[PDB]
């Protein structure tokens with residue numbers, strides 16, 4: 001089920017994963033001409049746009065009518081900037097086609113050739129769908145955790161397919177994820193551009209070194225019994241979640257181990273069974289989480305046997321509400337239900353105690 005879509009997603013993320021891994025230090029050193037500030041003061045770089053261009057152009061070459069909700073827009077980009085996006089794509093093509101070309105797979109075609117600056121603008125702007133309750137659409141965060149990317153640390157390339165408001169397929173590239181950093185083993189070929197994790201609803205969750213992406217290894221959450229032995233997953237950026245209220249949850253549950261890292265790589269480590277609880281409580285309750293920050297991990301965690309809800313009500317996340325989630329905060333865990341509900345009710349109590 002969804003065979004073609006899974007192959008398209010996997011290769012699109014794979015090619016964008018090599019580009020963003022390759023760019024990381026060039027964008028950092030040259031963080032005066034490749035980094036733009038958006039209306040909410042968040043950063044956007046040549047990497048974010050190049051990854052969006054590669055993945056939407058692969059989607060459209062294979063599925064010409066498909067709808068895409070992508071984070072970025074080309075509005076306002078100068079020609080000079082868009083020439084830099086094209087150049088990075090072509091430079092990545094020269095490295096990528098030497099080693100990793102996939103037989104019988106097209107990233108571009110006659111209709112969407114990805115040759116000109118106008119092609120780049122058009123492709124980026126096919127990500128302007130607003131989502132919603134009915135029908136099939138793609139959901140894309142080209143670089144999830146751009147601040148992690150700019151710190152030379154973790155970031156992810158995230159794509160999902162949503163159908164009738166439910167995530168059916170997810171694919172997350174984590175180009176800089178080294179599993180030895182945590183407590184685990186790294187697989188053959190992980191060093192060039194990290195790992196790809198993926199899942200289709202009902203068919204399990206799997207991963208592979210990005211450079212391979214042919215041999216897939218099944219993953220599953222772990223099942224620890226005592227919260228005192230568990231490990232939390234939290235972001236690094238203090239403005240993305242309430243770290244002090246997450247510390248209160250940890251103290252109440254006697255949790256003393258925590259991993260901080262940017263992006264939906266966090267969901268991948270939960271799905272691999274390397275940590276137990278992802279916490280993301282909101283500092284301000286007016287914030288609405290973007291669907292592209294959670295859709296790919298939602299199906300991956302579900303298929304790995306975990307649970308995924310908001311941070312207060314303990315209800316499933318609804319990916320049919322448009323570009324954002326109407327609930328407050330996000331919490332995911334290895335389950336079971338008793339563990340998950342203990343974490344979420346503790347979160348609701350801490351938030352209500354403000």
Ligand SMILES: Nc1ncnc2c1ncn2[C@@H]1O[C@H](COP(=O)(O)O)[C@@H](O)[C@H]1O
Pocket residue numbers: 141144145146148234235236237239240241261262263264287290293
């Ligand atoms: N005020 C905020 N609250 C929650 N998430 C945010 C906020 N500002 C930006 N983000 C998201 O944080 C995501 C990365 O999450 P993370 O790396 O886990 O901290 C980005 O893709 C942004 O959409």
Ligand SMILES: [Mg+2]
Pocket residue numbers: 042043044071146
């Ligand atoms: Mg951004």
Ligand SMILES: [Mg+2]
Pocket residue numbers: 048071141142143144145146
């Ligand atoms: Mg992003």
